[PDB]
Design a protein around this ligand. Structure first.
Ligand SMILES: NC(=O)C[C@@H]1CCCc2sc3nc(C(=O)NCc4ccc5c(c4)NC(=O)CO5)[nH]c(=O)c3c21
Ligand SMILES: [Ca+2]
Ligand SMILES: [Ca+2]
Ligand SMILES: [Zn+2]
Ligand SMILES: [Zn+2]
Length: 163
């Protein structure tokens, strides 16, 4: 449930920065998807996320294709959708999304908000969950719903780390 090793952030106010974008959505839709994804975790913990557009943020977000400098290359359409690093300095906490994927703000593959929410859990220190209905479950599966709040299993996960 919680990223192994137990490494976590030691502050409650963290900064993030969107370094580049995706041509499939407007820059505003991208920024909104990120903001809402961080909000899911913020309402269930003491964590407060603030955006900056310059300087070294704690959490860097970016869209890359195949090899992109961290020895973990993406694989083209479908398959790996994105990945993120556990809390720490430097590349720690950063999240990358595969630029070759179709990104949407709809139920069509693949919803940026949903993938981002999942990736940020890793950025915060959570590991994969066995609960098929959890945000942190290993495989992506968009679920049509009206309640846009964190599943109880993910709430337990974050509270276990940050209270
Ligand atoms: N309908 C929505 O806008 C999302 C829905 C309501 C808001 C809260 C949550 S948490 C969640 N979780 C899932 C889901 O498939 N979780 C497992 C998962 C999600 C995203 C992923 C992965 C796994 N694995 C990856 O490698 C990439 O990103 N599906 C949802 O629809 C969902 C929702
Ligand atoms: Ca970082
Ligand atoms: Ca891919
Ligand atoms: Zn990467
Ligand atoms: Zn994951």
């Amino acid at each position: 449930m919680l990223t192994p090793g137990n490494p976590k952030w030691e502050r409650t106010n963290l900064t993030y920065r969107i370094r580049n974008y995706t041509p499939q959505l407007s820059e505003a839709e991208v920024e909104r998807a990120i903001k809402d994804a961080f909000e899911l975790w913020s309402v269930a913990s003491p964590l407060i996320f603030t955006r900056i557009s310059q300087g070294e943020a704690d959490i860097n977000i970016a869209f890359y294709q195949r090899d992109h400098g961290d020895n973990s290359p993406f694989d083209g359409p479908n398959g790996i959708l994105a990945h993120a690093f556990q809390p720490g300095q430097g590349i720690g906490g950063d999240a990358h999304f595969d630029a070759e994927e179709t990104w949407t703000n709809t139920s069509a593959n693949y919803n940026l908000f949903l993938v981002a929410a999942h990736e940020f859990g890793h950025s915060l220190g959570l590991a994969h969950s066995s609960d098929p209905g959890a945000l942190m479950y290993p495989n992506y599966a968009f679920r049509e719903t009206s309640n846009y709040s964190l599943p109880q299993d993910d709430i337990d996960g974050i509270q276990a780390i940050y209270g």
